[PDB]
Design an enzyme around this catalytic site. Sequence first.
Site, short mmCIF file in Angstrom:
data_model
loop_
_atom_site.label_atom_id
_atom_site.label_comp_id
_atom_site.label_asym_id
_atom_site.label_seq_id
_atom_site.Cartn_x
_atom_site.Cartn_y
_atom_site.Cartn_z
CE1 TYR A 1 -3.99 -2.11 0.25
CE2 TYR A 1 -2.81 -3.12 1.95
CZ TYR A 1 -3.80 -3.25 1.22
OH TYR A 1 -4.73 -4.08 1.38
CG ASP B 1 -0.41 -13.66 9.18
OD1 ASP B 1 -0.11 -13.82 10.19
OD2 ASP B 1 -0.63 -14.43 8.27
CG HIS C 1 2.39 -8.50 -2.53
ND1 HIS C 1 3.29 -9.26 -1.86
CD2 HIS C 1 1.49 -8.00 -1.41
CE1 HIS C 1 2.87 -9.29 -0.54
NE2 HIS C 1 1.95 -8.56 -0.09
CE1 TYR D 1 -9.52 -2.45 2.90
CE2 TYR D 1 -10.26 -3.89 1.02
CZ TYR D 1 -9.45 -3.70 2.26
OH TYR D 1 -8.72 -4.47 2.64
NE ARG D 2 -5.21 -1.17 3.76
CZ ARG D 2 -4.42 -1.49 4.66
NH1 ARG D 2 -3.18 -0.96 5.01
NH2 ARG D 2 -4.61 -2.57 5.23
C1 LIG Z 1 2.08 -10.22 2.73
C2 LIG Z 1 1.06 -9.12 3.17
C3 LIG Z 1 0.00 -9.08 4.10
C4 LIG Z 1 -0.50 -8.10 4.68
N1 LIG Z 1 -1.55 -8.41 5.56
C5 LIG Z 1 -2.19 -7.35 5.85
C6 LIG Z 1 -3.66 -7.65 6.77
O1 LIG Z 1 -3.55 -8.88 7.15
N2 LIG Z 1 -4.08 -6.60 7.24
C7 LIG Z 1 -3.82 -5.15 7.03
O2 LIG Z 1 -4.43 -4.45 7.43
N3 LIG Z 1 -2.77 -5.07 6.16
C8 LIG Z 1 -1.98 -6.15 5.90
N4 LIG Z 1 -1.02 -5.83 4.81
C9 LIG Z 1 -0.71 -4.51 4.34
C10 LIG Z 1 0.15 -3.77 5.76
O3 LIG Z 1 1.53 -4.77 5.87
C11 LIG Z 1 -0.43 -3.37 7.02
O4 LIG Z 1 -1.58 -2.86 6.83
C12 LIG Z 1 0.74 -2.71 7.98
O5 LIG Z 1 0.20 -2.89 9.34
C13 LIG Z 1 0.58 -1.09 7.72
O6 LIG Z 1 1.90 -0.60 8.00
P1 LIG Z 1 2.05 0.29 9.26
O7 LIG Z 1 1.16 -0.45 10.38
O8 LIG Z 1 3.50 0.61 9.53
O9 LIG Z 1 1.50 1.69 8.93
P2 LIG Z 1 2.29 2.86 8.35
O10 LIG Z 1 2.75 2.83 7.24
O11 LIG Z 1 2.84 3.66 9.38
O12 LIG Z 1 0.92 3.83 8.15
C14 LIG Z 1 -0.02 3.50 6.92
C15 LIG Z 1 -0.25 4.79 6.22
O13 LIG Z 1 -1.22 5.87 7.15
C16 LIG Z 1 -0.81 7.14 7.16
N5 LIG Z 1 -0.33 7.34 8.53
C17 LIG Z 1 0.34 6.68 9.47
N6 LIG Z 1 0.63 7.05 10.56
C18 LIG Z 1 -0.34 8.34 10.79
C19 LIG Z 1 -0.30 9.42 11.38
N7 LIG Z 1 0.20 9.27 12.81
N8 LIG Z 1 -1.15 10.37 11.19
C20 LIG Z 1 -1.44 10.51 10.05
N9 LIG Z 1 -1.35 9.49 8.80
C21 LIG Z 1 -0.69 8.65 9.12
C22 LIG Z 1 0.44 7.41 6.08
O14 LIG Z 1 -0.05 7.82 4.93
C23 LIG Z 1 1.06 5.97 5.98
O15 LIG Z 1 1.70 5.62 4.82
C24 LIG Z 1 -0.22 -6.95 4.34
C25 LIG Z 1 0.76 -6.63 3.45
C26 LIG Z 1 1.63 -7.74 3.02
C27 LIG Z 1 2.73 -7.46 2.06
#
Ligand SMILES: Cc1cc2nc3c(=O)[nH]c(=O)nc-3n(C[C@H](O)[C@H](O)[C@H](O)COP(=O)(O)OP(=O)(O)OC[C@H]3O[C@@H](n4cnc5c(N)ncnc54)[C@H](O)[C@@H]3O)c2cc1C
Lengths: 533, 538
Positions: B90, B149, B397, B481-482
């Site tokens: 994402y 996950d 991906h 949705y995302r």
């Molecule tokens: C194999 C694989 C599986 C995955 N499975 C899942 C899953 O099961 N569920 C899921 O939800 N995701 C999944 N993901 C996507 C991703 O890995 C997760 O959502 C991950 O937890 C998001 O990154 P983060 O928590 O570090 O967020 P961050 O990268 O820190 O934040 C996400 C985005 O939100 C905004 N943001 C962050 N913090 C703030 C702030 N304080 N104020 C304002 N805006 C902000 C920014 O634009 C940022 O880019 C998956 C990805 C992969 C590659």
Amino acid sequence: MLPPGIDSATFQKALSAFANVVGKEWVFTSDEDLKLYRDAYSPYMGEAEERLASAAVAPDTSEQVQEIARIANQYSIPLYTISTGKNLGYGGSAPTYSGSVVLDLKRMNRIIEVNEKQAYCIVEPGVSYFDMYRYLQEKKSKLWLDVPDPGWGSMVGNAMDRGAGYTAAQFRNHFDAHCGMEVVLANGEVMRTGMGAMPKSKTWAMYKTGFGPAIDGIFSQSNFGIVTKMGFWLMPEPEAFLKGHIHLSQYSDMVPLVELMTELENSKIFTGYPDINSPAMGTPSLAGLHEFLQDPEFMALLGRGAKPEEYEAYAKKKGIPFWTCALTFYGPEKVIRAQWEYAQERFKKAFPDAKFAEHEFYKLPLTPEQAEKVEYPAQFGIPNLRTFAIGHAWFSPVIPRDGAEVLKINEVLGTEARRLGIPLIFAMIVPVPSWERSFTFIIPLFISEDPAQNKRSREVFRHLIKVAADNGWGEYRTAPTFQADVMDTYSFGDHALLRFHESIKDAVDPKGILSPGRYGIWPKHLRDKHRYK
Amino acid sequence: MLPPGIDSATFQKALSAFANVVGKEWVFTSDEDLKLYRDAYSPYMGEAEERLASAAVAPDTSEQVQEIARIANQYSIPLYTISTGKNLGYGGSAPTYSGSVVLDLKRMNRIIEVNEKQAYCIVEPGVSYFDMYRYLQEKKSKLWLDVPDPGWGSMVGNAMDRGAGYTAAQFRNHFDAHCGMEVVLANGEVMRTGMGAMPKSKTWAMYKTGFGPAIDGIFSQSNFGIVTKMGFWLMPEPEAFLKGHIHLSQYSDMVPLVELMTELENSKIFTGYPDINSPAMGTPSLAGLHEFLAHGPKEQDPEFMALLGRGAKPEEYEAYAKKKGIPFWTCALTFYGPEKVIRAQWEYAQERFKKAFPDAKFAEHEFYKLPLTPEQAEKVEYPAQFGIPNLRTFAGHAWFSPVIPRDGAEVLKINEVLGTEARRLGIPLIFAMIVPVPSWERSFTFIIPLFISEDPAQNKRSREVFRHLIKVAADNGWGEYRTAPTFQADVMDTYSFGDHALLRFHESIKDAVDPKGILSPGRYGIWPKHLRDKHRYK
Ligand SMILES: Cc1cc2nc3c(=O)[nH]c(=O)nc-3n(C[C@H](O)[C@H](O)[C@H](O)COP(=O)(O)OP(=O)(O)OC[C@H]3O[C@@H](n4cnc5c(N)ncnc54)[C@H](O)[C@@H]3O)c2cc1C
Ligand SMILES: Cc1cc2nc3c(=O)[nH]c(=O)nc-3n(C[C@H](O)[C@H](O)[C@H](O)COP(=O)(O)OP(=O)(O)OC[C@H]3O[C@@H](n4cnc5c(N)ncnc54)[C@H](O)[C@@H]3O)c2cc1C
């Protein structure tokens, strides 16, 4: 009456243009016709500051709503949108800003969609709980409503004030149960929120947020838009209904009762409305008999304003419980009987002297006639007027699911209330668990025939609001009389929250025509004059 | 690198002022440092449109965030806020606008509050799921997280992207489980939402909306503020866990399966993640993932491999499946609660499914009395169902995840429609069918994976194709949705009702809350006024 700063000629042109949209018979200007838009429970009844309408307009369609907004915007006419206008206790049918034109949406009463298999509806603002209940029951629908009690009002208008009801936890919060909206903006443009923003979306009533900023919430307790359509998630009719009574003997049991009841609620052992009363103190729960139907020892206790602790000896002697907790369970008979058995086991382990009774059990569906005999029909999503079949406002500060806080708010606000002489009736105000994870602590205000009394009631309530805020207890919904008073308590970051709402207000409604003053939010052209003091 | 339209002297003044707030060692400018701020899964990897950062600032406190915002606003420095930057699929750690200064909140990793009795926490954005789970497990907490996950990432960051997990229905939607936020606005002011707007509020993590307009939602998938604190509602650890399998014989069973499963879910017969898969078509499942992880690959039937090889349609697997006696559909229902409660719930679900499907078979797949020991936790089918953040499926991906109704006829229509536009183009669809994922109640996600290539030309083809699939899905009322920054403007364009009223509305709020336009320019297709014409979608 005229909207302030609007000359009579401008107002008459505005009204002619409205009549050209909706018909002259749907534009109301007479003192007689406008009396029906007065707040029936106005805390300013008959006084200078009473909130009065300049006029009312009753459109038939969202398209007419768009044209009325266009016209109001051009002429800078203040508009106050209502759905059914039954907001008694919280402002009635009257505007927040005296001189506003009421936009009355009661004719837009179309049921746009009901989906039985996916348990949702989409409704216009004029669809009352009575209309929707009749529609679903005539269709032998296996969908329930979540209704206020009594059941007057609108699915939309109630949700726009963030109102509440008495079925399963996920539906008691009306606005939280909504999915998708249509909004008309101050400039007359129409906008769909969530998945509805996609033309031909199949998911408007199924996926709440849509894509990008999730904006639906800014329209509730607000003046940022005119809502013309709303989706709701509906509760499937469960197999069965079980209400269980837990009886506890000690005043001091409140603290562990709150902890255990909240754990079981958060663990989803029960999803129904948990109802806590004190038989010892004679406080009522949802027992309907109360109004429908006198130990000297008890009457003396109540006479001298005895504290709750003083009822424990009396209760113990009569074999009366100090607390009853009624737990409601929805689902298959075997399932809810197992949930109730688990609830009893946890309560018996924490309270070895606890007593239990099965209070109600029904296999659903009920007949119309069996429904009329249930303790509290709102728990079955039946909107009704029975509760008061044999004027006011309220301060309803929100506290945590903590028994120590239940005691502290009683100790703190009960005394300030006694000092300034609001008639609190029972030893104690018992916390209301409307929604999971908090309580509301409900203090009534009674309208007097004497305006001098009403003035002191307003001054006393404004004091109770400040005292509550000093202890971190805030109000969640209020009448226009107190809306700017309560918004002033949300003062973190030098009133950052209000200054934030004022920025959005000026962006979405630059002319400031939508419901000026609602929840303390004044448009830029009125903000200097109406700054809170 | 410079932020676009900002001169070296202004940038130097801003960088110096940042280093005066956070200290010189927490302002990053070298190419080598900034390489960690690139999208590890960039669909533009190595190309001219790749999202890069001009600098990064890593503050220790919300007060340092206020001062950083004040400085960026003073010098019109574009800022992209991340919590832990693990947003792989994402956008990863990379900004939506190349030349943005990344505001990295990973040092803000304080657990502000955990309440066992009322089942909530308040956290800073640097608090990772791993950190929080470790904190709760060492305290022997009776609270669960709802984790993605794999379990990398931030409770706040994931919530701000409206991410999802695998426990009970009311926690699987991470943003929906949040209660209260603290936000720093573009001008450097701090604001608390809900009950936190009352100083000394006791209810910030207990009562979601507070008083007046309920605003928290506008900060999610947005660029309206910098989130410094968030409350979450947490799931009490249940007494027990039960997973039941329903086995159905026919392809046509999908339509009534979806109807009955959705009714039982909406009736709260179960609250766990319902897992639907096809043994017959060999579609992925929590169960097939455990097997592939435990025993590695398995020798496939050549009759199965013949069907898969010739891209046979689902209906053609029914005869094969009834020959080898394998189910066409398996629905796994997960129940949390007292043992006698969940056993009664599963009994009731079996009775309902047996009446609807007289041929249905059933099995109890998993049962545990909680809490799990560390040893049992290692051996459960899908640890995320117990709130355990893990890296089992780490042993790149992006995705097109359009949302559809709980309607079997839609599940078929999305397969027929997108499982041909994709066949006409060259996108590799593996199985006979994409089986809908019930992430949240009352809807499905239909997951098409985009596999990032070492071949930039193949990544450009992939982008063009997915942009097509987004338009075809839109024309059938299926919305995403995302999504990754690559597709954010593309998806926002599909939400065009009322001549793009939604985006023009967001743009109005953008201009009121961020008039100099410094917060995360372009995020979810929202460009500040000064960049709006140049970046207008095409
Ligand atoms: C194999 C694989 C599986 C995955 N499975 C899942 C899953 O099961 N569920 C899921 O939800 N995701 C999944 N993901 C996507 C991703 O890995 C997760 O959502 C991950 O937890 C998001 O990154 P983060 O928590 O570090 O967020 P961050 O990268 O820190 O934040 C996400 C985005 O939100 C905004 N943001 C962050 N913090 C703030 C702030 N304080 N104020 C304002 N805006 C902000 C920014 O634009 C940022 O880019 C998956 C990805 C992969 C590659
Ligand atoms: C004895 C008693 C018991 C009560 N019990 C309950 C209870 O159980 N639960 C409960 O929630 N309330 C209760 N109330 C309060 C009130 O009666 C209900 O909330 C009632 O349903 C609200 O009126 P309504 O639905 O007609 O909404 P309206 O009055 O139509 O709307 C409420 C407000 O929302 C705004 N609004 C309405 N429609 C729109 C729109 N389309 N666009 C934008 N803004 C709009 C307006 O400012 C309006 O004043 C009770 C009151 C009394 C006196």
